[PDB]
Structures are given as C-alpha cells and as structure tokens.
Design a protein around this ligand. Structure first.
Ligand SMILES: COC(=O)CCSC(=O)C[C@@H](O)/C=C/CCC[C@@H](C)O
Ligand SMILES: [Cl-]
Ligand SMILES: [Cl-]
Ligand SMILES: [Cl-]
Lengths: 295, 293
C-alpha cells in the first residue's frame, strides 16, 4: 500500500511519486529511476520489500518525466535532478512517519549516478546505494556531429520551433552520442524494453527525450563529482554482464571511495535484469542490510 | 559609436550588450566579462581598439547580470552562460556588418573559462582568447561548510524566502567556498575592485552560485577544445587564479595555440598599464592570423 506524495522544488516544480509508509517513525529510502524512466518500472517491487522490512520508501518521477512537472518535457538534466533530490529529501524528512536522521539515497543506472551527486553535497544523506550506475555517455567519434546537431536545434528553437525530440534508443538500438551501449547488444535490449507496446502500469511514460539532454550530458563530469563523495557509506551493485555501463568503469569509480563502502557483483545479470530473477532477493536483502549496518 | 544589441536565448531570456560595428562586413569578437562583472568594466577600452582595427565587437552582461534578463538575479551558472553564448553567436552572426564565418570568442577571468566551454561545442567559434582564466573554485577545507550552507539556503527558500544573497568578496576578501584568492591577497584585491556608468551593477551574488560552481569541472571541458585556435594571456603574478593552473591547462591543448605571460601583472591588471597595448595587439594579430574566413 502506497500514497501519492508531492515534493516542491525551490523553483516551484512539483515532483510526484509513490510513498510507501511504515508504522511509527522509521528510516526512509528515496529511489531515483534510470535514464528517462518512471517510478512504475521495476522499482515498486523493491519498494514493497523495503517497506516490509521497515523502511519508508519514496519512488518518484524526476523533473519533466512522467507525472512530475518540468518544461521542456523529458529534458534530462542530471545536475538538476541532483539538486531536486535536496528538495525531495527536505519534504520526505518532514513526513511524520520518517526519521529525518536516517535518510538513504537509492539510485539505479543513471539515477544511481545522480544520487551520488546529491549525496556529495547533502550531509542529510546517511547512506548511498548505486545500482549499475552509468558514468560516461559520449563516444569520441560521434562528439562533433552530436555537437553540431545540438547547435542546429538551438537555432531551430530560436526560429520558434519546438525542441527536437527523439527516442533514447532508436529501433536499431542507437543514439546520436553513442551512450549506454548504442550500436551494441545493450542499446538493442534498451530499445526492446522502452519501445514495447505493453501495459507496465505507467501511462505517462514517454520513450522520447529532448535532444538538449545531450548538451547537459556533455557538461556533466560525474566521475569528478563522485570524488567529492568521501564520507557517505556507499554500496554499489554491478551486473557482471552489463552491456550498457561497462562493469570496469563502475569498478574504477568504486575504487576511489575512501570511506566505508561495499561492492556486490550480480553474476549473470545485465543492466536491466540486475534486480530480477534468481539472486534478486539476496541482492535486495543486502541493500537493507547495508543501510541498517550504516544507518 | 556603439549601439545597444539584444540577443534572445532559447528559453526567452534577453541578453543585452554593446555592439561596436565596423563599416562594411568583417569579423566579430564576442567578449564575456569576469565573475559577476558588467560590460562597462574595463572591456569598453579593449573593444574600441578592436573596432578601430576592423573587428565588430560585442560586450554583453551575462544572464541575470546588469542589463540582461535572468532570474534569480546574479546567480552565476557558468554552464548556462556557455549555452547562452551559442545563442549570442547566432544573433551576432545575423547582423549586417558581421561575417558569420569569422566569429571569435573572447573572455576574461571567469568569462574566459566560460568562453572555452562554449567553444568546445560550437564550431562557428573560429578562435578562442582566454585572459587570466580561472579553473578552480573550492578550497577543500571550506567545502563541507559551503555545501551545508547551500542546503540550508534551499530549505530557507522552500519556506518561502528569497534566495540568500551575499557579496562575492567580503571586507576580508573571503567567500564561503574560498574562490579567487579568498583569505589572501587575491580576495582583498577583488573586494576593493567590486567595492568602488553601469546603473545595474550589483555587488552581490546568489549563494546558489556556489552550487553551480560545485558541479562545474572546466578542466575536463577544456580538454574538449581540441581544434579551436586558442590564445591564453596569463598574469605572471595572478593572486586569484594560480598561473600554474592556467599553464597546465594550456599545455594540454593539441591544436594551434599561443601563450603569453604578462610580466608582473595581476588578475585585474593584465590588460592595464604598461605593456597592455602590446598584449591587445597580440590578440588582434592572433585573431587575424587564425580567423581569415
Ligand atoms: C526485468 O527487469 C527489467 O527489465 C526492468 C527494466 S526498467 C528498470 O530497470 C528501472 C529503471 O529505473 C532502470 C532503468 C535502466 C535503463 C535506463 C538506463 C539507460 O539509464
Ligand atoms: Cl505523457
Ligand atoms: Cl555572413
Ligand atoms: Cl576564401
């Protein structure tokens, strides 16, 4: 059982999401979805487990995505999502059933890297959990053409046209900047899930992003921001066969963390299946174990 | 005589500045001022020399600064300033006297680093001039305190209050993050500079500026500038941006480049006084040589 809980940002935007409350006053986990994904995809299964084990759990749609406010639509600014998490933490910490001293930031894929950026600046975050985080986006060979495409979109917007939209992965599993396994098995699998005409419980999901998302991704240096995360206990869950975010890149980032940390590799899992199938129950139990051990 | 020229951004914000036109059609230099500085500080003298040598020149107040649109006021987002430059390049390139194939980005201090970020993405920028670029902002000892103050400003705003404002340099020359020589000679010189014809100059910034500086990693973005001819002018005695940091970034550039160290000059005096004429002529010569259409 969950209730709809809305969080206001400092610029007046409403973040909308699901809040799985627990009885009494207990800790809270705030879950951020992956790139352009909505709260209804996969995460409600994890939240019910978190809730049954005594954790208030909040899954939300990030700015301009799903049920949440934000214009232009599906313009993914990771630094803005990280800042919004500070405002989300504020509202969730004020809820009656929430112990504000026991806040954990949980993120999957893109949302895991966004969560770490928020934890670097917000000491209210007592624990960080990153599932298959993505730390790079541009293929060097496609940079110049993607840049030119971004500029021409700006000029097109200055002439009155709408911001150019496109799927994060086309039918060939590709995208202009080559992110997240574009041109390989991972991008093809990503398109298969995002483009499927299936009821996933998320009417407001949209398999399109604004092209200017790639402009924000060009500024973002997440590997440098994660170096600021030097106090928050961090748990990283990496799929062994991640074809969208190279496991070695995730492992290189985990190496730099000097504080209390824990690494878990999900054998035989990919970017999208790391929290599903056999072994997924043991992985989720390890997440709550790590939080309680550090909360 | 200069004319007021406005540049619309993709989100509808109006950027305002001075345009120094030349007869006929010719190259254009877009000058970005330093941290929270207005177009009337120092730069008009440089633009008149550029104009007399055949260069259209556009000095502008960045977003939320001076005469330009932008809210909240004096919130310095360098990444947004970099994106705004793409729109500024678009409007300046459309002007009758401007050769759209001969656009040069020019920046001083903070504005020099912002110009490099815009040059990394826009191939219309045919040359880059960076004057005393600043490439780091946080002192490690002040990081956690500044981060906590930023979160508390967010909680204050969420209760309905205006964003917390403060001078970028106090009377001791300090600021919460330790940027631009805070606590030493650099900060005191910047405090005196900010403290004494721009009606909309405001000696204050939003605290949330420091949140934007925390995300910024310009040393990594400067690595993307691998094609644009770049001239860097570094003061030998820069007390606000370490010369070693400026030189280290310059040495990484693989393309056509030139480095000039202004002997005995500081962050704010690099383009003033003795030897400043030769530095400006070195800029015009680098631009004529590298941006020929
Ligand atoms: C069998 O389980 C599944 O297929 C669920 C697939 S959606 C999911 O994992 C929830 C979402 O937060 C994570 C998305 C990662 C893909 C987007 C990535 C490019 O950032
Ligand atoms: Cl929709
Ligand atoms: Cl032209
Ligand atoms: Cl020719």
């Amino acid at each position: 059982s969950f209730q709809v809980v809305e969080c206001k940002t400092i610029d007046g935007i409403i973040i909308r999401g699901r809040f799985y409350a627990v009885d009494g006053k207990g800790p809270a986990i705030i879950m951020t979805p992956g790139f352009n994904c909505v709260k209804e995809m996969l995460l409600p299964d994890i939240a019910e487990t978190f809730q049954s084990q005594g954790f208030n759990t909040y899954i939300y749609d990030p700015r301009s995505i799903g049920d949440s406010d934000g214009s232009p639509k599906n313009l993914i600014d990771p630094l803005q999502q990280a800042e919004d998490l500070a405002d989300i933490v504020t509202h969730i910490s004020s809820l009656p059933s929430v112990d504000s001293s026991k806040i954990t930031l949980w993120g999957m894929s893109f949302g895991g890297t966004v969560s770490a950026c928020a934890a670097a600046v917000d000491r209210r975050v007592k624990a960080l959990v990153m599932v298959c985080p993505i730390l790079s986006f541009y293929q060097a060979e496609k940079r110049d053409k993607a840049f030119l495409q971004l500029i021409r979109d700006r000029q097109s917007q200055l002439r009155g046209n709408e911001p150019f939209m496109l799927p994060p992965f086309n039918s060939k599993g590709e995208n202009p900047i080559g992110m997240a396994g574009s041109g390989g098995p991972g991008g093809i699998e990503a398109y298969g899930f995002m483009g499927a005409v299936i009821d996933r419980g998320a009417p407001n999901f949209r398999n399109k992003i604004a092209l200017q998302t790639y402009q924000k991704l060009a500024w973002w240096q997440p590997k440098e921001i994660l170096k600021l995360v030097d106090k928050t206990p961090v748990l990283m869950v990496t799929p062994e066969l991640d074809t969208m975010s190279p496991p070695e890149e995730q492992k290189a980032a985990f190496e730099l963390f000097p504080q209390t940390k824990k690494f878990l590799e999900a054998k035989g899992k990919g970017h999208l299946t790391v929290l599903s199938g056999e072994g997924s129950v043991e992985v989720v139990d390890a997440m709550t174990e790590f939080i309680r051990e550090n909360v």
